[PDB]
């Protein structure tokens, strides 16, 4: 869920970017 | 613990800022500090003249500083040397090299800060607080002033127990936005402690 650092929604909730939430 | 500051409440309508100037985010705090030092040095000097207010305006590297005083004869001095010394100390404080004006206050009893200052003086001289208040309200009411109120805080008469002495008359409609009430506050430093003094004066409406 939102608590999973390794998920899209996780990065979104944490407000970061990375491998699982690219900057396009 | 209620009743927000009436001046601060009416600042948009029927009240105006004492410091009126524009500045950016990198400017503001500095000009503000400066203003505060100006008001500071001026309150610690011109008190004997009974300053009811100090307005401060700026354009570019220049400052208005319009001082509203009950007795301008004090701030001017003999031949006008006092005002020179004050512009001097002002220039030594801030290097902006700015000007100064003196506005005489008509009927010192209609500007709340002066009223509160008088009541406070009386309290510090060990006057009778109840009578001092009733008298002050009387002097305020007898000249114009569609309403008036004065409030003194705890340790009245040096009493061990703090009290509040009230004594107001006329109309003081604090909740009315269009009111235009003057508010003022004075302290009293006594041997037994500190006394707060508030003054409300309701003059005209719309």
């Amino acid at each position: 869920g939102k608590g999973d650092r390794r998920t899209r929604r996780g990065k979104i909730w944490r407000g970061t970017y990375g491998k699982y939430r690219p900057r396009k | 613990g209620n009743k927000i500051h009436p001046i601060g409440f009416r600042l948009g309508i029927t009240r105006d800022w004492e410091s009126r100037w524009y500045a950016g985010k990198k400017q503001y705090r500095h000009l503000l500090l400066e203003d505060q030092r100006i008001r500071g040095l001026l309150e610690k000097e011109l008190y004997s003249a009974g300053l009811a207010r100090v307005d401060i305006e700026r354009a570019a590297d220049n400052v208005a500083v319009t001082v509203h005083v009950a007795k301008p004869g004090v701030v001017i001095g003999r031949g006008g040397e006092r005002i020179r010394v004050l512009r001097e100390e002002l220039a030594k404080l801030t290097g902006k090299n700015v000007a100064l004006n003196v506005q005489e206050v008509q009927n010192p009893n209609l500007s709340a800060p002066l009223v509160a200052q008088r009541v406070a003086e009386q309290i510090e001289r060990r006057f009778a607080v109840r009578r001092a208040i009733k008298q002050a309200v009387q002097r305020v009411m007898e000249s114009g002033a569609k309403g008036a109120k004065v409030i003194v805080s705890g340790r009245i008469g040096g009493a061990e127990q703090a009290r509040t002495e009230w004594a107001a008359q006329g109309r003081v409609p604090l909740h009315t936005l269009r009111a235009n009430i003057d508010y003022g506050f004075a302290l009293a430093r006594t041997t037994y402690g500190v006394l707060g003094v508030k003054a409300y004066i309701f003059l005209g409406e719309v």
Binding site: - | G1, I4, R20, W21, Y22, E57, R58, A59, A64
Partner: protein, 98 residues
């Protein structure tokens, strides 16, 4: 083609000064396209009322910067006559580019 930006905390003084500039530039110059409002920049400060605890009191303040436009076409030299310096307002700040 002269860029002007008027900024102030009081919209009354802004409007008055802007229309003053406009009337100054109307007689000496072109049609004076006139002040375009531009958005306000509003900065808020939320602060607890009391000096101690009581977290649920607050009462925030706002500080708003109003803007104006001007931009007179036909930069006549005759215009800078009524222009340059004649103004009432204090807390109005003027920006000028070419």
């Amino acid at each position: 083609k002269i860029r002007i930006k008027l900024r102030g905390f009081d919209h009354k003084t802004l409007d008055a000064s802007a229309q003053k500039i406009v009337e100054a530039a109307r007689r000496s110059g072109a049609q004076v396209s006139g002040p375009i409002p531009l958005p306000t920049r509003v900065r808020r400060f939320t602060v607890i009322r009391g000096p101690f605890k009581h977290k649920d009191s607050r009462e925030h303040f706002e500080l708003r910067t109003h803007n104006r436009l001007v931009d007179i076409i036909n930069p006549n030299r005759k215009t800078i006559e009524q222009l340059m310096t004649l103004d009432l307002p204090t807390g109005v700040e003027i920006e000028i580019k070419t």
